[model samples]
Target: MVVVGLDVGYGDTKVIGVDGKRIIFPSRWAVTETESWKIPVLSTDGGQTKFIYGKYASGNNIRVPQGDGRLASKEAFPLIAAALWESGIHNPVDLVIGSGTPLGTFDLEVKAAKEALENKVLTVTGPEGEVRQFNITRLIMRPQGVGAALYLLNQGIIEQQPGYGVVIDVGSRTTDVLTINLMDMEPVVELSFSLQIGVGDAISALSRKIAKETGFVVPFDLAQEALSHPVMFRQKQVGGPEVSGPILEDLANRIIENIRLNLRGEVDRVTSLIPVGGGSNLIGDRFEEIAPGTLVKIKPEDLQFANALGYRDAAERS
Candidate 1:
């Protein structure tokens, strides 16, 4: 038997296996079609259906599951299977999977998400064209931001305190805020919230703004690439601070304001402020100066994988 933590996030998918192996890939996946001299085409039906992921997944017919409760969607299975396969589970086996749903929909969707994955038989064909199969025996669901909290707790990163600790999981398309009492060391769903603002939507909004600025529609991929690498936009390269300066300012402000509003004015009780996720790099590092207590610092390489690894740790405990 194998234990795995699967996070089929909107921007990317993350998975951690019992062997301490981890993998992260873009969440979008697409069907496979082969046009060769030997084989004309391929089918996408039942057992014959083929799929591709990550860098190879693009063009038309690709699915990027989004919204609040997309974890239960059928489209997520492919991503989940791919994640498992990428986690070095290429052979047939039984799995105990720990997963998560966004805080905004965690209450409404956790049960369904668990049910959707439990007892599932996942099959995936990787780049090597090898078939991998796994059967899910148990599925545990935790809220998004809560997983980061669990990670901190498991790693003993946060000092033992007697007050609430706020962990903001800045995800791809959604920012999840979780408030857990350090004194109690348990999750209080009532204090957690999910904001619809994140990197993906912010990029989309900025893309529109830039298009309006140039009187031409900018591709979403180019806009995304512009954040990290310069892209050829007509005459010049656009990947500097000017490209996403306003968006980052607005995003950081919104994150601060919403964190305040989501805390329901109980911010004074929060002793520790922890930010973990892919979008954490977008914001400035002044949160600790504004907030109280010790701020938790997660390495850049581990930021995106923290939640998934936390889920895996929880599964091992389970």
Candidate 2:
């Protein structure tokens, strides 16, 4: 039997198999009215339509909305199918798949999500007419932030000794804040919640800022690129690479403020802060800046894949 951990975030989808291999792709996807004669064929269900995934999907103008409720949408199917296809699991065999959702909706949605995926035979055909079948014998759904906590614990980052801390996953649309008793492996449910503010919010703000300042209607995608790279706006180099620093700082401050408002006195009890996800690279330093004395850890190269790996860990433990 093979176990697969899949983190379907509003910004991206991450998959980590038991073999220690991983794949990351944008969460965006689109199903067409007809198949394409293009290179690298897309996914299809043997119908008149074809499905596009990730950056190519975005390039083809597919827009995925951000919200805590996306896990239940029909659009989510193609992304999951795409993830499984890219996972390189060709043989038809028993599979246990683990996935997650924001803490705020986990209790209400996890069971249903699990029920939807469990005990299912998934047949997805790639654009090149390649077909792979997976009999998903079991499905596990965990609270989003807890996966990162489980990941850190298994990595011995927080399990080396007993401690209590928070795991802030600064994703694209929602930032999940989780407070846990690491020694007990219990989540402080009342203290955990998801914030609406995240990197995508910052990008939206930045796009508006650019539009107002330069009269250039900067698209959200271009605004996102500007954060990590130099963007040519109105045929001129708008800001140096350093421009993203302040915007990211503002986002970090917003997240910190939200934490302060929500956690209140609980923030002081936190011994460490584990920041993960795509936004980790952008706001990890800012988290450290605000929580000076606390141990802040942004897991190395596998930052974005942490939750999926952790989910896989949970499956193995089960």
Candidate 3:
């Protein structure tokens, strides 16, 4: 059986395939009246419910996962269908998929999503018009941050012995913070919560900051990229940590303060405060400025795929 870990995030969709193969794409797509060279059609129920979506999507119908309650959103399934199509599901094999819901909606949305996916055959038409069918035998939906927590427990990267640890997954629209009692390898529910803020807020604020300074309106996508990679705005380079540092400092401190509130003066006893997800990659080391020694620093390569990898590992074990 091949297990795939799928994180259908608000900012991006991440899928870890059979082995080391993986895919990361924007959580944006559009419903089309038709398809062309780059666009793909995802059809189910004999084309009764169908749409064209891809990185090539544009126009008035463009849909990006907004707000919360992902599973309940109209754009959720299409993004997942897009992920499965491009997720290297080529050969016929027994497929068992593991995915997640952000902490706030886990109990509310997970079961409904799993049931919705069952008994449905997804027919995907590629850019070249090659057709494929997706038939899944099983699906496991877990809390969004659980994957990263499990990865940390199994990878042995943190302190070896069992102890309390917190994983802060700063996503685009929300941040999911999880506290795990490593000894039992289970979540400490009371301490793990999801914050409604993330890098999206920082990017939006940064975009306005740059526009007010340079008189150029930066698109949301470019602004997100600019925060991490500095781009020249006419003459002066705008973005990078120097430009985005202060903006994200507030974000970092907010997440840290929330964690401290959840932990309630138990910070010192926590062995590791691991950062994961896109926002984490943006403001990783900055957390250290607020809480000097407890937080662990990670680069994009390690941080970006933490949840999916951890989800895949858990699926394999399960």
Candidate 4:
């Protein structure tokens, strides 16, 4: 039996296997009907469905962000198939798979997502026409914020810490926030909610800042890249990390304040703060500055994979 944890985020999809292999790619996907013979021999081909992802998706200008972030949607299948294709699994086998949905949406959406994925046979063709197949026998869905907390618990990081913990997953479209009773491993669901604010909001803020100055509309993908590297516009370097750092800090502060507002009297009970997901790296440091005793269990590089890793642990416990 093989176990796999797949975190299909609005910004990116992260996959981690029991064997310790990891694959991270952009969540963007575009379907094309071009003939196989007419396409480049090196492009990704999922049999009849051909698509691109990550840097390739950006290069081909076909990457389209799915704002809804629904795993049961037909548009999401290609991204799921791509993760399986990159998993290095080429034969049918019993597989225990784990995934997550945003808070409050879990009870309504997880079942449908599981039904769409479980006991299914998927065939995906990678670059060079190399085909791989898998039979997913079981699918487990947990609320997004819980997985990161579970990861810290399974690692014995939070198991000994007896206090309330706030797990904030700063994703692209939503910032999922939850409060957990570390002693009982139970979630304070009434105190949990997904905020509309996300890293993408900050990216848009930065893009508008540039547009006001340069009068050139910065595309979302380009703005994302500019967050880390300097972007060239009109034969000049523009929008580097220096300009983006403060914007991210402002966004991070807003998220923390929002949590405080909703948590209300329970704010004092939160003894620890945990940040996870792609936006974690962007907002983590500032969040830590305000939260001195924050328990940042996952490294920056591993933040995106924290939920996936925790999902694998959850599957093992089952």
Worst 10 residues of 1 by lDDT: 35-44
Q: How would you encode candidate 1's per-residue C-alpha lDDT over 185-249 as one tens digit per residue?
A: 67667777778788777678767876777765667878877766567787756554676777777
**What clash count goes with each model?**
0, 2, 0, 0
Poorly placed runs, candidate 1 (over 4 Å): 35-47, 125-129, 284-286, 289-293
Models ranked on lDDT: 2, 4, 3, 1
Model 3 residue pairs with clashes: none
TM-scores, all candidates, are 0.88, 0.91, 0.87, 0.89
- List, residue by residue over 55-114, the lDDT tens digit for candidate 4: 455345465446433678765777787777677765666788888777687777777877
lDDT score of residue 178 within candidate 2: 82
Q: What lDDT tens digits, residue by residue, belong to model 2 across residues 1-318? A: 888998877778889965788898888876665555233445545655676678776455585745532555666777788888888877786898877777776767777666667787878776557778889888777777778778877777777346567888887877888888766777888888888778888787777777777888877778888888878877877643577778888899999888888877766667888888778887786786445677657547778877787788888777
Give me the candidate number with maximum TM-score: 2
Per-residue error (Å), model 4, residue 31: 1.7
Q: What residue pairs clash in candidate 1, if any at all?
A: none
How much is the lDDT of residue 41 in candidate 2?
Answer: 43
Better of 1 and 4 by TM-score: 4
- By TM-score, the better pick of 2 and 4 is 2
